[PDB]
Amino acid sequence: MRECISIHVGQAGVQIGNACWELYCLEHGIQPDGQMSFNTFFSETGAGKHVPRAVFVDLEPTVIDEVRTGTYRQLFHPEQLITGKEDAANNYARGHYTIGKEIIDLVLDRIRKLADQCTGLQGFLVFHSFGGGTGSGFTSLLMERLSVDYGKKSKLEFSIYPAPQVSTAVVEPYNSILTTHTTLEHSDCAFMVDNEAIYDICRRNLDIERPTYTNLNRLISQIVSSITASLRFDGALNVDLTEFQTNLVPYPRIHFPLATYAPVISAEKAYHEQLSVAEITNACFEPANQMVKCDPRHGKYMACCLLYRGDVVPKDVNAAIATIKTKRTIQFVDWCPTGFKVGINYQPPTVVPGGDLAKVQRAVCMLSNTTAIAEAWARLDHKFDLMYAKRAFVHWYVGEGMEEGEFSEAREDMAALEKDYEEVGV
Amino acid sequence: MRECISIHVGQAGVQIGNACWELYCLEHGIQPDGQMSFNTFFSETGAGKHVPRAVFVDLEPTVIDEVRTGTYRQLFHPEQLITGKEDAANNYARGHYTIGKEIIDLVLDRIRKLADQCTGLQGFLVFHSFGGGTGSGFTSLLMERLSVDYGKKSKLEFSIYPAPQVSTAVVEPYNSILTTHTTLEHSDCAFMVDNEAIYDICRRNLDIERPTYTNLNRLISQIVSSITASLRFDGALNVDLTEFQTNLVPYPRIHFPLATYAPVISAEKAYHEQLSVAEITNACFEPANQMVKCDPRHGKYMACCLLYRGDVVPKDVNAAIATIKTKRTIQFVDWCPTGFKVGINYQPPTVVPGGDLAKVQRAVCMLSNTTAIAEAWARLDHKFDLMYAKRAFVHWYVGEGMEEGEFSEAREDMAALEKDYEEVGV
Amino acid sequence: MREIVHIQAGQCGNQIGAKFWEVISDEHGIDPTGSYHGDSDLQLERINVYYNEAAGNKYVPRAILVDLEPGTMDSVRSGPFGQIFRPDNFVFGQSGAGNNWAKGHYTEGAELVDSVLDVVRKESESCDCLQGFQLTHSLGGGTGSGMGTLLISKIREEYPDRIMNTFSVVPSPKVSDTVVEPYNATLSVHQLVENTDETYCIDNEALYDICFRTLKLTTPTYGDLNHLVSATMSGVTTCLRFPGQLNADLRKLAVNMVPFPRLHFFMPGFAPLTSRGSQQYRALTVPELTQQMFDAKNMMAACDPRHGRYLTVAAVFRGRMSMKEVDEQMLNVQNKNSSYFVEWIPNNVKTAVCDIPPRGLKMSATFIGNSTAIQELFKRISEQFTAMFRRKAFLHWYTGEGMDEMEFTEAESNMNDLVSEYQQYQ
Amino acid sequence: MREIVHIQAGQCGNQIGAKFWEVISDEHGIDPTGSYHGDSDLQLERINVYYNEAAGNKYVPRAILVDLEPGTMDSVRSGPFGQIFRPDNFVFGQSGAGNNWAKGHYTEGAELVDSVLDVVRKESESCDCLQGFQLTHSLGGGTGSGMGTLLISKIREEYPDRIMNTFSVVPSPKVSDTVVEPYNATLSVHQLVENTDETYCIDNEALYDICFRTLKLTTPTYGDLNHLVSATMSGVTTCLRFPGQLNADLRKLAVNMVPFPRLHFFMPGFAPLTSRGSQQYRALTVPELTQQMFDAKNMMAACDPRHGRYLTVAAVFRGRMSMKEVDEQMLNVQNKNSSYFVEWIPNNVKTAVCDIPPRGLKMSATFIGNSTAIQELFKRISEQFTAMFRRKAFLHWYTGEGMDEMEFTEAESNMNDLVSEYQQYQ
């Protein structure tokens, strides 16, 4: 069958992955042990157990140590959980050059072994961050290696974007740019969120006064599930990972989707509400409900995909789409009139006990490429320039095999990308 | 019936033999007493008891004294357990010339007596070490005597090779070379391991942090069992000792197999794992899973034999072999396209309580001759040269009947062997 | 005589086809176990046209199920009538099609096609007298479009004297379902124009309209839409499988509906089409049925027939009715709406009649129109395609599989020529 | 009249033969106690062909079991039908064969052969009218190859006017099972060409392919493979043991299949071959069976028949069927695929018919092809042998038993001549 592989790299990615795995377990009916198209994410043992078709990497042991003592522990087979000695230290040049070129081989071998189980290896999933040390260089390296090995196979990146206003790290701007330099010419598709948007969503739609990482991660997990379920489950108008590549990559370089998931509704607000298909669609297209700091009015949607779940009717969806098209505010690109893919699954999303969300009969995941996102890129570039002008926090990077011209080249690439976006918009 | 004789010589060999015998007892259903094709390794008494078709020799009494007070004691018949007065003293020239030519006759007589029980005497097993004093010269002497007596009969050596990096003795290099000089023109087949590789295996695949002799010995015992079980038990595609000689000896001088046993899996790692036949085969052919310090990529496999056990299907095995052949990295010799023998036994391996390994439905023993092993030989020769240049630790040897030219001759022989290997590779 | 070979390719095609078989099985009294439990000898007389008989009064569709991924066919199998199909008639891959004509036609489809062709050959050899081939696809995907086109080409090369007809689900310009839809459709049609004798053109928009307006269906299921298509399909071949006053062969229908080789794209329709509630206000006359059939709301292609003229129309009526009455009524229709009937053809319509209603109706009818108006559909697709091509959008996915701009241009030229031809015979 | 003497030599030969006897015993209503419990007088009419009767209605195969080691025959004895054999018909040694033709033919086999010959003589003397001898071997071992060849030579010297046929399991070049396989096979064939009238050539690869594709067997057992061979064997001699419309003697088959003395290596096949599940989609016609028989997937030798031409084909059908129908169908086959049938022979096929199906089938058939394509198999073995000989690899094991280079060269010359002959009559 059509079957998949999961990779979670850097602390953030690992954390996300935990939640994702929990969600998967809840959905297909798997315990903490492994007891009971389910085989896209779970290979069977001799008996009883099922093994997540997964890989977990971090150079910080403390992250994966946590995993190894949690409830979700003996679900995983210790072949997968790899650890380093000294961490990436928020430094691309340690993640790619120094400590990267050491343990990557092991991981590659593991991946190969896992593949040798897949008859129909569809592709991969990579979870990281444009912002971690591990996740910026190591990830890139891994991608490169995968390209060298397979090439034809499907590759995805779930990329936690730098939030324009809110800082976390001091050298988030360099790292991200470096990642862009290297990942851009390998990974055919990248699905992106930022934390700020998620926080906003939690505040407004869910009425949650305390923004924290667990609930946020759960949201992302839901999106992931929605993306997958086409492979994992039945439904009229189904979807493949390769279909996303075909559908959401007009030019080979431009491949940076945004995401969004509706409904994002609490226990109370589910009542005092019908939740129709059209309504849900409208919610998905709302400026505020996007999962990144990007006004979709400040550009044009090139290519859009919408993955409806549970009790849904095609005609209704079509009507909703027509309505959306009719709206003059939500602009589309002149040259692509057919900018929609419809995905419908008879499986409805199931939410994890002790979490944010309530039951919803129908939901959507919306994945869109736009000229509007370019603003974020521009902002990032500006940030990079501002701190590269001083050349501050550069003595970390130079020591682990770097050059001054690399940065310039990266900037040039970014500029080119921006230009391309502008052209597309025109 | 087809029936066998066991000889364990030098401390190391004796130790190995203990473990082997324990394993055998566990398998066929024999107690510590002897109470209950089982007759290849156990001759029956008048009633109750069974007597291991065995011989135990060491010039150190302390080794066999231990045996004589252990739980495995009254299994053995004291006719077999022979002891000396003064030990070999890590000196070939005491093992062969001086104390060797004294008690060898007794041992020979015992062997003859044992044979006079075998209707179908298939052959022998000799366990020793390229590295003990006893095991280097005495062993050779014994082999010579056996050749003189029988000649046609099947002869095997389980030879503990000198680990390239890790030293144990000071004159391990001379002893080994001397053994090679004499054993090479008698013993038709020798199955070899080193300790370093075993330690590595224990560390990686079994997660064992403490490398010790007992567990190591058990591993070797398992291999031995696998080799035998074709004689000891039923199965489609069976094997004889003579078949090994025919199969794994292209030219009469080149007869130094490596060994390996998979799966090498702990209690946990058995779960989070299916253990398919193909997988097992792949594991067996892995660079690290070999039982000697020898990269199989640095040469070509001449002749290979694989002894599958338990729940196995021939078709699966064939498929696995095909897959292996397809892999371009694992090189074979130009002139031998058919370089596989398949051995399948309905008996699955049974592991000794209070030990390393867990239950595995299917396992393999893989026995291979290569051009790659020549590197080890070269290293050994270099070592010999380095310390023969000074002529240090020579005053031990000269005193017990030796000559200077012998060493030179041995070196020449080694060189010739190397040349032959090179030719084969070409 | 006159037996038909059925092929379903791609997801759409496969799911529609399942329903088609379900319908026809019911019609011919065949239960899901492949046993006949009907009440009329007429039911079995010509069962050969779709079914083969096996030992124990088992009947088996002469049907081939083709897909480049397993999920769809697995679902089919799991379904109610899925177990009626001969298991060796499922031909499927595991590598996805990415809504990519190139994958279906050039690469992944090319790998599977020979195996399909062999099964086709066997079915042909099992025919007393092969009439033709019936295919079910989508136009806008990768499998139905690319693989489907491929398959048709090969079959026409092998059976160039036989009837080749397709039921092809096409894009609806107001509600696109995929982003590359125009590319897939244009590439397909380029080859369907040349290698099919008739193509029944269904667009889901029209079906939805039918469902809403006449059937009073607030919530159409894909199942219900498929039922509508299925009914048309059944109707088309009724006169091959049953008696009649005036009978229609498939070939005869082609001859009556095709004035020029290229113009063989039909709009199907059906009657009666009402709700469960708006039936008691109606009686079932030939006039009533004809009125329904010529109602724009009962068309299954995306056109207003009044935006053009009918070149030729075929009506197939089922049930006992006066030929005189039927002819007279059609003459009246011609007289009153003479402007919508091209003046080159006296007696603008053909009538066929089957002396046998479909279960639970007294009378039914099925309509086949060949209208100059359908040019508008072609125009819309050509424009959609053209804009994207102007910017070479999404093109790398196809060029990477070897396709060239010139081929695309050729396709467009073909499309334009088609529309020009329609204009000429307006 | 026309009684046949059965011999099994070597492990393969012995295990296959056990199954053969099991099959035939079932066919003739003989239970494991040697008692008849059948329901038809036809069952006993010609029981003489394979069995001798003893006091108390005991029936005993005229079978000889030969081996150079005891284990295989002990296992046979332990088996279900093992106790049916007369104990004095087990002729066996204890010294192993080492996969060595020299041991089987020159040395250890020479010691045992006279005793075998005496038993053969007794069986011959107990025959009302000896028809011939049936042998089962492998080609690639020591016993079946060396001893088997020896035995055949001696029997032809003693019974030069009788039929000598072998079922010989041969190497499959993609998956070799022993290292010296080419040596053993070439040495055997060198003598089989001269001293047998027909040899049925089975390769395990083909059997595995059959098992996987048609029988849907994920996990073939040697038992199942042996069953397939057994069915062929039974089929071959059905017309000696039963009535028919048109009957086939063994000699008559030889006459019909052998245009030149040397060309008597046949590819056997069988029909029907389907799963338990893919049978209800089929009916059992002569056409169907013939289609199956001429399907490459139903061949038991390692060739594509389309890489050559059939010189002659014999089909033996079992069950009640129209001779007219059969002949007509075969004529159609000849007409449509005339290029694969050598034009020297009008009526390229022979048909035989038995008015008696094998239990639980209405109809069955067994196919015997003599194709120029089978030259490819010979080529592969010759090449494999040749390379090893170029380097005199493994040769000491054989030269030590007195064999000479000239003999080896002769063998190769014979092989090459064989292939040249096939080329000539391509």
Ligand SMILES: CC(=O)O[C@H]1C(=O)[C@@]2(C)[C@H]([C@H](OC(=O)c3ccccc3)[C@]3(O)C[C@H](OC(=O)[C@H](O)[C@@H](NC(=O)c4ccccc4)c4ccccc4)C(C)=C1C3(C)C)[C@]1(OC(C)=O)CO[C@@H]1C[C@@H]2O
């Ligand atoms: C009480 C009564 O008379 O009920 C009718 C009925 O109410 C109506 C509305 C039926 C009904 O059809 C639908 O509602 C419908 C649903 C999905 C897709 C298409 C139609 C009916 O369901 C459908 C059903 O059709 C048949 O029985 C035909 O043989 C039809 N069969 C199937 O499609 C079928 C359905 C399920 C399982 C197996 C077969 C057929 C038509 C052409 C060729 C072969 C078979 C009929 C007459 C009716 C009901 C039952 C309400 C109508 O449809 C048909 C196909 O006859 C819809 O407009 C017509 C007019 C009928 O009067």
Ligand SMILES: CC(=O)O[C@H]1C(=O)[C@@]2(C)[C@H]([C@H](OC(=O)c3ccccc3)[C@]3(O)C[C@H](OC(=O)[C@H](O)[C@@H](NC(=O)c4ccccc4)c4ccccc4)C(C)=C1C3(C)C)[C@]1(OC(C)=O)CO[C@@H]1C[C@@H]2O
């Ligand atoms: C319900 C039913 O009809 O079952 C069939 C059946 O399903 C099929 C698949 C049978 C089945 O055969 C196998 O699956 C098989 C297994 C191992 C090796 C070879 C075949 C069957 O097992 C085998 C069995 O064959 C016989 O009974 C013949 O007399 C056969 N007998 C034996 O081989 C035999 C087996 C066990 C013990 C003693 C004899 C035979 C054939 C030639 C000459 C002498 C005897 C049959 C018809 C069937 C089953 C039972 C499912 C088929 O085989 C034969 C030999 O008939 C496999 O393809 C054919 C087609 C049959 O339809």
Ligand SMILES: Nc1nc2c(ncn2[C@@H]2O[C@H](COP(=O)(O)OP(=O)(O)OP(=O)(O)O)[C@@H](O)[C@H]2O)c(=O)[nH]1
């Ligand atoms: N969603 C989510 N994002 C996180 C989490 N932890 C960190 N991030 C984001 O990840 C970026 C920091 O990268 P990390 O993944 O912590 O760094 P790392 O990959 O572990 O690399 P090193 O710690 O430098 O070895 C910032 O943009 C954070 O907002 C988390 O638990 N959930």
Ligand SMILES: Nc1nc2c(ncn2[C@@H]2O[C@H](COP(=O)(O)OP(=O)(O)OP(=O)(O)O)[C@@H](O)[C@H]2O)c(=O)[nH]1
């Ligand atoms: N596997 C294994 N190897 C051993 C053991 N003891 C020693 N060796 C190896 O054997 C070599 C040393 O030879 P020994 O067998 O101890 O010496 P000996 O044969 O008793 O000879 P003397 O003690 O000199 O009379 C070294 O290569 C050791 O690594 C053991 O218990 N197990």
Ligand SMILES: Nc1nc2c(ncn2[C@@H]2O[C@H](COP(=O)(O)OP(=O)(O)O)[C@@H](O)[C@H]2O)c(=O)[nH]1
């Ligand atoms: N009637 C019907 N149309 C479908 C179905 N599934 C997909 N479609 C239509 O088929 C087109 C998409 O092609 P599809 O067959 O899914 O892609 P493929 O699987 O690569 O061939 C779109 O126009 C869909 O609306 C179905 O089950 N029934």
Ligand SMILES: Nc1nc2c(ncn2[C@@H]2O[C@H](COP(=O)(O)OP(=O)(O)O)[C@@H](O)[C@H]2O)c(=O)[nH]1
């Ligand atoms: N069908 C079948 N083939 C076998 C069996 N055992 C061995 N073979 C084949 O026989 C060849 C090996 O010869 P073998 O008979 O084992 O050696 P021998 O015992 O010295 O004659 C290889 O090609 C094996 O695949 C068996 O039980 N059944």
Ligand SMILES: [Mg+2]
């Ligand atoms: Mg970290």
Ligand SMILES: [Mg+2]
């Ligand atoms: Mg010692």
